[PDB]
RNA sequence: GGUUAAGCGACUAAGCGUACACGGUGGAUGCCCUGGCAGUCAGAGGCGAUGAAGGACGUGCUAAUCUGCGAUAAGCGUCGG
RNA sequence: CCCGGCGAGGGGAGUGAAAAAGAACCUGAAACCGUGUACGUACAAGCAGUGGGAGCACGCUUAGGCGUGUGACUGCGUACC
RNA sequence: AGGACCGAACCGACUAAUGUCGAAAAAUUAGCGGAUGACUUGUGGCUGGGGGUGAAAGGCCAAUCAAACCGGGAGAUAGCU
RNA sequence: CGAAGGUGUGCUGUGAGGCAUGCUGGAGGUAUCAGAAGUGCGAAUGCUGACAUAAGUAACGAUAAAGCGGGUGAAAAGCCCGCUCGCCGGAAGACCAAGGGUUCCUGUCCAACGUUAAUCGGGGCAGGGUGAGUCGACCCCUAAGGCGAGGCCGAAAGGCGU
RNA sequence: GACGACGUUGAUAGGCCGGGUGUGUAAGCGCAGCGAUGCGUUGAGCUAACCGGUACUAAUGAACCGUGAGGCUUAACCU
C-alpha cells in the first residue's frame, strides 16, 4: 500500500501510455435526409435512415 | 494570419483536458468540431465551447476563411488551486486542493 | 458520544461573567490584563 | 459464472427489479414512447411482449392475468380494447428500439422504446 | 535485363531521454515608504465622585466597518488666529 | 464590435511610454507542468557519470576543419552526511 | 410484600462480527444483564492540585492524571544525542 | 542612446570569484584603499511558503427504491407538477424547553460552498416577516447555595458568618 | 481488453407458434351442502435460461486506417 522510493516522472509517463481517448471519428450520413448523425444513432431532429422516427 | 483563444481558470485538471485535446492536435477545424461534438466527456464541453470561439476570432478579427483552416497548437497548462480542507478520520484533516486549469486554442493557416 | 461542552448561558454567566470575574481581587487582574493586552471581547457578552 | 444464464440483474434486488419493470411497462403503453438506458430498453422488451401476446386471444381470465402482472386496470383498459385489432397479424415482435444517444446526466447509453404501429 | 537462393541491411516510435526556443504555476531577489526598535534633548510624571482608564449602543444623504462625537451625537456657543 | 449561457473567459479596438504593465496588476528565479524543433530509443539490464567514439542534425569560417547539440557502442566505476 | 420473577422504554457494556489512513480519536448489525431499586434523568449549586473525590481501578477531575491546564521563574539543566 | 536583479554567452584567475556582453528589465549602483559584522548552507524526523509523488488509484458517509411524461431552461438521473412504485408511523410525525441567532419567506444569481452536475439549496445580492391586561420570563415568595452592614478571626490579601 | 458467431446473399439475439419440462385439477359458470368446502367442466391452467422452425423488430449505402510489384552484393540458372 505504500511507496518506499518515489518513481520518476519517466515511469509516470509510461503508465499513461495507454489512457488515450478512443476517437469516435466514424460519423455517418443519412440515406434520404443527407444530414450527419453518429452511426447507429439518431440526430437532434429525429432522423434515422431517412425517417422522422421520434418527431421531437 | 494567426489567432489565439484562451479559456482561463477552467475548473478541472490538466490530464483531464490533455486527453481530448490530444486528438485535435494537427487537425482541420470541421473534423475537430465533429470529433469534439461526440466525445462524451466534460473537457469536450470545455474546449469545444472555446474552439468555436477561436474560429470566431478568425472570421471576425483575422481570416474569415474557415473551410481550409487548421489548428496548429493547443496546450492546456496548469493554473491555481482552491485549497479547501477535507476531513479524514480519527481527528486528522486533509489539505484538499480543488484543481484549476488554463487552455489555449491557437488557430492559423500553416 | 456525550461530548464535553454541553453548553448553557446560566452555567456560563455565573461562572465566567462580568460581575463574577470582577468580584474578587484575583479575578480583577484578569480584567486588568485583558484590558492591557487590548482584547475587544472582555469576557463573555451575549 | 453466468454460463448459459439470462435476465440481467441491473444492480437491484429481485423484488425492486420486478416492481420497476411493472411501472415502466405501465408507463410504456400510456405515452407510447419512453427514454431509458440501453439495457433496460433491451430488457423491457423481454417483459412487455408477453402482454400484447396474451391480449389478442381475449378472455375473462386473462384480464386478471394482466392485472396480476400489472395491478393497473387503466393500462388494462388500453389493452384488449384497442390493442386487439391493432395486433392481430404481428406474429412476434412489437418493439422497434431506437438508439438515441448519451445521457447528459451521467453518461448512460440512452435509447427509445416504442410500439411499432405509430401514426401520432 | 529477368529468376530461385544466400549474406547483410535503414526509414516505423504508443511513449520515454537530453539541449534550445515558448510560456504555465509560483511570489524568491533588487528597489520603495506615512511601520517599528534603540537613544540624544528638554517637558510632563498622572487620569478619578463639579464621575476615569477600558467597553456597549447609537449619530450622517447612507448599507456596512474604521475616525470623531454623544437624544445639542463627523457636531453648539465663545473670544482669536 | 464578434463568440459565449444578456456567465466566466478571450480575441480586436481605444488610452497609455509599455497591457510578453489589466485589477490574481512593478520586478517574476527554482521545484513542478506542458508545446515545438533536433538526436538517441522497443535483445538491453545495474549510483546513471567520466575516457574513448561512428553517424545524423546545425552556427560558421573559409572551403582545411574547429564550435555547439545528441551521443549507438566501449573501458573503468557500489550516492551524500 | 419483594434491593422477587418475564420483558419493552430508560440504562449498562458480555460475547462475535465489522471498522480500526474508521460513517465514529470507541462506533454500527446479531444477539446479552437488569428494568419500583443501593436505580434512572433534567435543571441549579458545593468541594480543588500534594489538594478534591472515589461500592478502591492509582480510577476521575473538559479525549491528556503515580499529581491536570495557562502564565511566570526560565533561554532551567543535560558529562547526552 | 538603459542601474540592480533575472536569463544565456565569450573571455579570465591555482580556487573562493572576476570582467565584457545579447535579451528581459525600468531607477538606482559604486572604483582604489581601509573600518565594523544579522558575512557565505544540503542535511539538524529544523521552521515557513509553495509544488511533486502514491494516482487519475481510494472513496463519495448506513444495502428506505426507483421508474415515466410534461414544463422552465443554453445544457436535466438530482429542481417544480402530475402519475405509480418503496420506506418511517411511542418515528425518519407534529409541538416546547435548552442551545443556535435570520438558519423562515418572495425576487434573482451559480465564481466559490453542497464529497458530483445543478435552472435547485439551511450558499451569496436585495427586500420582508416575529403584532399578547390572560402564553414564558421580568415581577411578589423561599430551598441547595453565594455574597455579606455591625462583628469575630487572620502576616497582607483574605477566610467564616448575623 | 482479447478469441468466437452473424450484419437483410441474414436464425446472431429478443419476440412468436409448437413441443419438451416443472407445479398440480386455474379462473369463470352449474350442481351438492343452512355454512367452511366438495364434485363436474379439467392431468385442466400457468409455464425463467431448454429444443425445432418463422425474419415480426433490432443487427444500414457508406465513412475510416491500410496503397500504387517491394534496397545493396555475390553465386547458381534464364539468353
Swiss-Prot record, chain A:
Any GO MF annotation of the entry: structural constituent of ribosome
SUPFAM superfamilies found in the cross-reference section: Zn-binding ribosomal proteins
Keywords for this protein: Ribonucleoprotein, Ribosomal protein
Any single biological process term in GO: ribosomal large subunit assembly
Glycoprotein as UniProt keyword: no
InterPro entries according to UniProt: Ribosomal_bL32, Ribosomal_bL32_bact, Ribosomal_zn-bd
GO cellular component: cytoplasm; cytosol; cytosolic large ribosomal subunit
Residue ranges of the region described as Disordered: 1-37
Disulphide bridges, residue numbers: none
Record-stated family: Belongs to the bacterial ribosomal protein bL32 family.
UniProt subunit comment: Part of the 50S ribosomal subunit. Contacts L17.
NCBIfam families linked to this entry: rpmF_bact (TIGR01031)
Protein's recorded name: Large ribosomal subunit protein bL32
Species of provenance: Escherichia coli (strain K12)
Gene label: rpmF
Curated annotation (Swiss-Prot), chain B:
Nucleotidyltransferase listed as a keyword: no
Xref: CDD domains: Ribosomal_L22
Keyword flag Ubl conjugation: no
Effect of residue 91 to A/D/S: Abolishes translation elongation arrest of SecM
Binding site for L-tryptophan: 90
GO biological process, one term: ribosome assembly
Pfam family, one: Ribosomal_L22
Annotated PROSITE patterns: RIBOSOMAL_L22 (PS00464)
Record annotation: effect of changing residue 93 to S/T/V: Abolishes translation elongation arrest of SecM
Keyword terms of this UniProt record: Antibiotic resistance, Ribonucleoprotein, Ribosomal protein, RNA-binding, rRNA-binding
GO molecular function, one term: large ribosomal subunit rRNA binding
S-S bridge residues: none
Recorded GO CC terms: cytoplasm; cytosol; cytosolic large ribosomal subunit; large ribosomal subunit
Function recorded in the entry: This protein binds specifically to 23S rRNA; its binding is stimulated by other ribosomal proteins, e.g. uL4, bL17, and bL20. It is important during the early stages of 50S assembly. It makes multiple contacts with different domains of the 23S rRNA in the assembled 50S subunit and ribosome. The globular domain of the protein is one of the proteins that surrounds the polypeptide exit tunnel on the outside of the subunit, while an extended beta-hairpin is found that penetrates into the center of the 70S ribosome where it lines the wall of the exit tunnel. Removal of most of this hairpin (residues 85-95) does not prevent its incorporation into 70S ribosomes. Two of the hairpin residues (Gly-91 and Ala-93) seem to be involved in translation elongation arrest of the SecM protein, as their replacement by larger amino acids alleviates the arrest.
UniProtKB/Swiss-Prot annotation, chain C:
NCBIfam families cross-referenced by the UniProt entry: rpmH_bact (TIGR01030)
Family stated for the protein in its record: Belongs to the bacterial ribosomal protein bL34 family.
Keyword match 4Fe-4S: no
CC terms in the record's Gene Ontology section: cytoplasm; cytosolic large ribosomal subunit
Gene: rpmH
Keyword Ribosomal protein carried by entry: yes
Species whose genome carries this gene: Escherichia coli (strain K12)
Subunit structure: Part of the 50S ribosomal subunit.
Gene3D superfamilies: 1.10.287.3980
Gene Ontology biological process terms, A to Z: cytoplasmic translation
Protein name (record): Large ribosomal subunit protein bL34
UniProt keywords, alphabetically: Ribonucleoprotein, Ribosomal protein
A Pfam family per the record: Ribosomal_L34
GO MF: structural constituent of ribosome
Curated annotation (Swiss-Prot), chain D:
Lineage, highest ranks first: Bacteria, Pseudomonadati, Pseudomonadota, Gammaproteobacteria, Enterobacterales
Binding partners and assembly: Part of the 50S ribosomal subunit. Contacts protein L32.
Record-linked HAMAP family: Ribosomal_bL17 (MF_01368)
A Pfam family assignment: Ribosomal_L17
Molecular function per GO: structural constituent of ribosome
UniProt name for this protein: Large ribosomal subunit protein bL17
InterPro entries in alphabetical order: Ribosomal_bL17, Ribosomal_bL17_CS, Ribosomal_bL17_sf
Organism: Escherichia coli (strain K12)
Keyword Chloroplast set for record: no
Main function: Requires L15 for assembly into the 50S subunit.
